[PDB]
Amino acid sequence: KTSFGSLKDEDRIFTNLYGRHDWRLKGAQSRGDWYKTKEILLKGPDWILGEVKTSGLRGRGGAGFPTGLKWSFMNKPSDGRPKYLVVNADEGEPGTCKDREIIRHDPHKLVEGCLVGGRAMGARAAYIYIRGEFYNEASNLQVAIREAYEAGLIGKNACGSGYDFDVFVVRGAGAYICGEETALIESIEGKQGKPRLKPPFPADVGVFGCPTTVANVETVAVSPTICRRGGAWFASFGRERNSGTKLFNISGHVNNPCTVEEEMSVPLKELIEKHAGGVTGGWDNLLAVIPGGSSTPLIPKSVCETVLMDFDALIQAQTGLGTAAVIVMDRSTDIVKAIARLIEFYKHESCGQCTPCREGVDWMNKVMARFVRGDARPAEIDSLWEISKQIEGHTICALGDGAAWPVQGLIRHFRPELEERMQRFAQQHQ
Amino acid sequence: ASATRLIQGLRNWASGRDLQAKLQLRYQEISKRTQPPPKLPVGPSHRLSNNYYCA
Ligand SMILES: NC(=O)C1=CN([C@@H]2O[C@H](COP(=O)(O)OP(=O)(O)OC[C@H]3O[C@@H](n4cnc5c(N)ncnc54)[C@H](O)[C@@H]3O)[C@@H](O)[C@H]2O)C=CC1
Ligand SMILES: Cc1cc2nc3c(=O)[nH]c(=O)nc-3n(C[C@H](O)[C@H](O)[C@H](O)COP(=O)(O)O)c2cc1C
Ligand code: SF4
């Protein structure tokens, strides 16, 4: 297959994405959830890990690490400590609102994903670290978890399989850094959401010091559908090493901002013009697209014409796939103001632990606040570039990377607009 | 400079040189004791980029 997109409704994993059907247990079982879950649990951890490895599922959180290879890090005998699946439901990325839709509208799909994934990794329980701002979504998920306990689907003898498995929901308290997996682990442990240094990876030392896999809501909730439909079904979509379906959040300057499930390697132009109603003012009104939420560098209209929305084609477009959160910016956008607001986000959402982010993200925000007004000189552009390169790769977690990358994308694609901003400041203020 | 031309001529004859063209006493030709303020340049390492000290 060479062309991708135009995903059929029979191949959707997240049916009832839009809240048009019953999210509760009767509606979930009438859509295929909790079907033959006992037969999945009784085929063992190795079969489930083989299905997830065969499916080509990569991490839907945004880095795209191979999910079966990641979950097989727990496939090892116990050493006295319990094992834990932890579901990352924080979702603090600007642009990204898909895990809210999974929790709010398909909650039993997430609970069955917790059960299947925790059986695959031998986990004792699931801690769903949900964002504290998602209060109605958290109570929604708790009603579904009560329905799953009262039906015997989780808990003591989950689905009649002889495997005991709890599902806990921990609410956040307003920190974007608490979606980073080790900072999330520290937030569950009752501390400041500061990321741990890796190694130890959480499969060695995770939550409470136990073996732990932190996995996104989307990569957890697709796993029962992967175990039922088969890994060869899920690997039949998208390009190679880019398998499956993906939730896309097209927001910003489109006619119809929406969340939509779509095949993996869909063109960005096809996605925007088909599901979002196109850019406001036509496709010729397009200035830039942040392809995968705030941490990915922007790409201009010349790149957006032919680019595919998977991991590898956006890496070749020197950006990232990320959370697949498409932020569309038309020609009327002050793009320096938008990227500087994004850097303002990253200094308000920075836990202050390590020196390059704690100091340099604030210093990049001050430089970007002067670049919006033009109150600068062009030698400070490359300077800012070097400042971003002194944050990238030198920090504890990738929030420093995710703050350096929008600066780098803005400089790389819009240096002349920065320069004409500064020179018109210089000619009307001197 | 205030010497009369008779003493100036006697002096130039005795030295054998034109002494008024090159006087060893200084007069208004020297620099002013109050100068305008300088604006001194900076060296090559005063740059905002490509200026790592290990290079
Ligand atoms: N979904 C969201 O709301 C957000 C997502 N992101 C995304 O997060 C990504 C960066 O996240 P990170 O987890 O910090 O980076 P990533 O490099 O480390 O790692 C992703 C996952 O792979 C595992 N992993 C990677 N290398 C491993 C190894 N050698 N051994 C064992 N496990 C390994 C990590 O434990 C982690 O769970 C970015 O691509 C960004 O797009 C960023 C912000 C918000
Ligand atoms: C600053 C920062 C914030 C993150 N926030 C989230 C998040 O809110 N939700 C999420 O699923 N992953 C988030 N991630 C990515 C996680 O670290 C981790 O890769 C992911 O949650 C679990 O891996 P997975 O993609 O295989 O599911 C964040 C990463 C960083 C650096
Ligand atoms: S880079 Fe920023 S977000 Fe990460 S540990 Fe350091 S201060 Fe925290």
Nearest residue to A221 (alpha-carbon basis) of A137, A128, A156: A128
Helix (H, G, I), strand (E, B) or coil at A188: helix
Please report where in the chains the tokens 């990738």 appear, as a residue. Answer: A398
Nearest residue to A248 (alpha-carbon basis) of A196, A310, A336: A310
Cβ contacts of A370 on chain B, cutoff 8 Å: none
Give dist(CA A212, CA A265) in Å, integer: 31
Nearest residue to A377 (alpha-carbon basis) of B51, B39, B48, B44: B48
Which residues lie with the beta carbon below 6 Å from any ligand 1 atom? A 59, 61-63, 65, 70, 91-93, 96, 179-181, 201, 214, 295, 320, 322-323, 397-398, 402
A350 lines ligand 3 (CB under 6 A): yes
Give dist(CA A396, CA A408) in Å, integer: 20
> Which residue type occupies A59?
G
Task: Specify whether the CB–CB gap between A261 and A271 falls below 8 A.
Answer: no
Give dist(CA A68, CA A53) in Å, integer: 4
Helix (H, G, I), strand (E, B) or coil at A134: coil
Q: For residue A377, give both structure tokens.
A: 């000189």
Give dist(CA A326, CA A290) in Å, integer: 6
Task: Give the minimum alpha-carbon distance from B45 to chain A in angstroms, rounded to a whole number.
Answer: 14
Give dist(CA A163, CA B52) in Å, integer: 59
Instruction: Classify strands A245-252 and A258-263 as parallel, antiparallel or unpaired.
Output: antiparallel
* Cα A248 to averaged position of ligand 3 atoms, centre (Å): 27
Helix (H, G, I), strand (E, B) or coil at A88: strand
Straight-line distance from the first to the last Cα atom of chain B, in angstroms, rounded to the nearest whole number: 59
Q: Identify the bridge partners of residue A358 per DSSP, sorted by sequence position.
A: none
A279 phi, psi to nearest 5 deg: -75, 145
DSSP state of B30: S
> Which residue type occupies A244?
G
> Which residue type occupies A307?
V
Give dist(CA A245, CA A268) in Å, integer: 14
Q: Identify the bridge partners of residue A249 per DSSP, sorted by sequence position.
A: A259, A325
Q: For residue A383, give both structure tokens.
A: 């300077």
Residues 6+ apart with CB under 8 A from A34: A25, A28, A108, A112, A148, A151, A153, A159
Number of CB atoms found within 10 A of residue A137's CB: 23
B10-B11-B16 Cα angle (round to 5)? 100
Radius of gyration of chain B (CA): 25
Residues 6+ apart with CB under 8 A from A64: A58, A311, A321
Give dist(CA A13, CA A109) in Å, integer: 9
Given resolution (angstroms)? 2.3
Experimental method reported for this structure: cryo-EM
CB-based burial, A280-309: b 16+ in 10 Å, e otherwise: beeeeebbbbbbbbbbbbbbbbebbeebbb
Give dist(CA A208, CA A80) in Å, integer: 13
Cβ contacts of A379 on chain B, cutoff 8 Å: 47-49
Residues in chain A that come right before a backbone break, where C and next N are over 2.5 Å apart: none
For A255-261, which contacts have Cβ atoms below 8 Å and span 24 or more sequence positions?
Answer: A255/A279, A255/A280, A259/A17, A259/A97, A259/A98, A259/A101, A260/A17, A261/A7, A261/A12, A261/A13, A261/A14, A261/A17
Q: Which of B49, B50, B51, B54 to mutate to test the interface with A (most CBs of A within 10 A)?
A: B49
Residues 6+ apart with CB under 8 A from A71: A49, A52, A117, A120, A121, A213, A215
For residue A125, the surrounding DSSP H or E stretch is strand A125-130
Instruction: Classify strands A325-330 and A286-290 as parallel, antiparallel or unpaired.
Output: antiparallel
Task: Specify whether the CB–CB gap between A86 and A185 falls below 8 A.
Answer: yes
DSSP state of A285: G
CA–chain centroid gap for A243, Å, is: 16
**Given an 8 Å threshold on Cβ–Cβ distance, is A386 in contact with B47?**
no
Task: Specify whether the CB–CB gap between A125 and A165 falls below 8 A.
Answer: yes
